[PDB]
Design an enzyme around this catalytic site. Structure first.
Site, PDB file in Angstrom:
ATOM      1  N   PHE A 120       8.410 -74.965  89.997  1.00  0.00           N
ATOM      2  CA  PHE A 120       8.784 -73.750  89.007  1.00  0.00           C
ATOM      3  C   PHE A 120       7.675 -72.597  89.016  1.00  0.00           C
ATOM      4  CE2 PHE A 120      11.966 -72.520  86.276  1.00  0.00           C
ATOM      5  CZ  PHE A 120      11.437 -71.614  85.204  1.00  0.00           C
ATOM      6  N   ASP A 121       7.803 -71.541  89.309  1.00  0.00           N
ATOM      7  CA  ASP A 121       6.790 -70.600  88.960  1.00  0.00           C
ATOM      8  C   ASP A 121       6.588 -69.826  87.951  1.00  0.00           C
ATOM      9  OD1 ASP A 121       4.572 -69.725  90.628  1.00  0.00           O
ATOM     10  OD2 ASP A 121       5.297 -67.715  90.516  1.00  0.00           O
TER      11      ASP A 121
END
Lengths: 124, 124
Positions: A120-121
């Site tokens: 998850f950026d």
């Protein structure tokens, strides 16, 4: 060896005024999903859309990751997500988080084969 | 060693759950307090009163234990508690629970020195 008193406390004690509260969601989820071992993960996001919609992002809008890698994708639509951020008072091993439910586009890095979300950026 | 795909799911997916709802307390708590490892503990009660108050039960009314043991005690007052019960559609390792809040007298077994709660026997 876990003592009996500690076992009773772990299994049966949850002293509080409103433990079932949604303000408590992050505290319980971060614990449950094992992100509070040795240190509190400072920030973490949970996505509530179907696993299929999230995996679908891997073939949606291509974007550069916050770290320079080039295998990130941004969801075409907003998604309901829960943002979890340590409170100004959380100290291991008593991690404390502020729960924030919002809807935003998410950016994830995709990898493997089939190509699926592996990190998850960010949310935007 | 967990796969990247699986790590993302654990850390970032929560699509099958009424998330921050009170109906979800038990699912998150049973998971956080490790009562869903290798098998889902079918039934479990959490006490919301203070540790001191629960400990103080050890010096209230003696009653017999369900198992015939003699070190059981019943609280003089009702206590706010939560009943967690595995639902019909639960299948390890995807443990699902029903959350039910009630206020009842609790019965615990006490042991060690000093005598502190070491087993939750029932609620009445």
């Amino acid at each position: 060896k876990e003592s009996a008193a500690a076992k009773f406390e772990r299994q049966h004690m949850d002293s509080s005024t409103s433990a079932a509260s949604s303000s408590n969601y992050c505290n319980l989820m971060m614990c449950c999903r094992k992100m509070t071992q040795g240190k509190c993960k400072p920030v973490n996001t949970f996505v509530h859309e179907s696993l299929a919609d999230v995996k679908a992002v891997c073939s949606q809008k291509k974007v550069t990751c916050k770290d320079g890698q080039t295998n990130c994708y941004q969801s075409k639509s907003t998604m309901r997500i829960t943002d979890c951020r340590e409170t100004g008072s959380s100290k291991y091993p008593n991690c404390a988080y502020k729960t924030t439910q919002v809807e935003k586009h998410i950016i994830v890095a995709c990898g493997g084969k089939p190509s699926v979300p592996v990190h998850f950026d960010a949310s935007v």
